[PDB]
Design brief:
Elements (H helix, E strand, L loop, with lengths): L6 E2 L4 E3 L12 E3 L5 H4 L10 E3 L1 H9 L8 E3 L6 E3 L2 E7 L7 E6 L5 E4 L21 E4 L13 H18 L3 E7 L5 H11 L3 E2 L2 H8 L10 E2 L7 E5 L5 H10 L6 E8 L16 E3 L2 E7 L6 H11 L3 E4 L6 H18 L2
Parallel strand pairs: 2-3, 3-4, 4-5, 9-10, 10-18, 11-14, 11-15, 12-13, 12-14, 15-17
Antiparallel strand pairs: 1-2, 6-7, 7-8, 8-9, 16-17
Helix pairs in contact: 3-4
Bound molecules: nickel (II) ion.
Nickel (II) ion binds next to loops.
């Protein structure tokens, strides 16, 4: 049944709750972003109002075939009224089209639902600065102090410099980047930019990217693999067998692969700096795991919460075990005693 952490009290609303059938008493279904564990259940047969960003609504129409009459896109950073309740959509710094949602309840309570987010100090100057938030529905994906990772900027500088050096040393090297969802487009786009190539990809992935309102996108991507020396493949194909196979397909145009796997966290992060990352190599194939995250690190999460000073926190990730729930509740209490709220 629908978990309580997907329901907004004092409303008929739910967030990211499309796999439970008809939720009794729900008048409006919000979708924070187009990742499968959040949209699970949606299709062309859905007939309730879906409220989302413009970019998520493009993906719902083009990829899932949801009918236009049930897609209700909202502009960001704008007070809107939905079924009698004031709401605002804010940029979540996750994947394209991802939002946080501010609910202003008729009784005076203010609720922030982060969806999935990567906390940033820029959020401290949005419309969130303008009033008090009482209850926080929080993306706790990496809520433990072991989870450190570098800035997205540091990670992209590493990838650009590695790719440019390899291809200038060997103009017959191919660059391959893994994907299984939207997000992390800077990794393959920044590398294609430094190399003077478009990124080549399947027709399915090209269709997906063309929904994302990315500026000048027709100049940066293509379905013609032969004209490209940056290829995108399913994340599943980023291993030695999959890559050896791909290289056979390119008909002796290339004699080396340099591949990137943009993982979330990996335990080489508790020890190793970005400067010190090395690949796994077999023969003429090398694979780099780069820690490019679209979720908050521990410290980023803690700073955002200590700034916001909510009265109550409701975690939305890692909720399925008692040890995980009790650990998170201990960190919330530490943060509150340190900051004095
Ligand atoms: Ni997500």
């Amino acid at each position: 049944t629908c978990p309580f952490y997907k329901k907004i009290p004092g409303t008929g609303f739910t967030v990211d709750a499309f796999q439970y059938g008809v939720v009794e008493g729900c008048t409006a279904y919000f979708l924070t972003h187009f990742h499968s564990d959040h949209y699970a259940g949606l299709s062309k047969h859905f007939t309730f109002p879906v409220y989302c960003s413009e970019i998520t609504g493009n993906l719902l129409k083009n990829k899932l075939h949801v009918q236009e009459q049930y897609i209700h896109p909202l502009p960001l950073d704008t007070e809107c009224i939905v079924n009698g309740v004031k709401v605002v959509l804010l940029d979540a710094n996750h994947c394209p089209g991802a939002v946080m949602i501010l609910f202003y309840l008729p009784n005076g309570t203010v609720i922030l639902h982060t969806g999935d987010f990567r906390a940033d100090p820029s959020m401290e100057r949005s419309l969130l600065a303008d009033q008090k938030v009482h209850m926080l529905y929080l993306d706790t994906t990496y809520c433990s102090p072991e989870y450190t990772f570098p800035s997205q900027q540091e990670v992209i500088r590493f990838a650009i410099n590695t790719a440019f050096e390899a291809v200038t040393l060997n103009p017959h090297a191919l660059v391959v980047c893994g994907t299984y969802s939207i997000g992390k487009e800077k990794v393959f786009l920044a590398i294609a930019d430094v190399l003077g190539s478009k990124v080549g990809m399947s027709q399915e992935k090209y269709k997906t990217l063309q929904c994302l309102n990315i500026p000048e996108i027709n100049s940066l991507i293509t379905t013609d693999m032969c004209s490209s020396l940056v290829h995108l493949l399913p994340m599943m194909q980023i291993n030695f067998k999959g890559l050896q196979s791909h290289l056979k397909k390119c008909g002796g145009k290339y004699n080396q692969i340099l591949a990137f796997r943009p993982t979330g966290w990996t335990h080489s992060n508790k020890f190793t700096r970005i400067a010190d990352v090395i690949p796994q190599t077999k023969g003429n194939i090398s694979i780099y795991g780069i820690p490019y995250s679209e979720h908050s690190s521990y410290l980023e999460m803690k700073r955002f919460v200590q700034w916001l000073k909510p009265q109550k926190i409701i975690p939305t990730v890692n909720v399925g075990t008692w040890k995980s729930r009790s650990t998170m509740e201990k960190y919330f209490r530490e943060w509150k005693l340190e900051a004095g709220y």
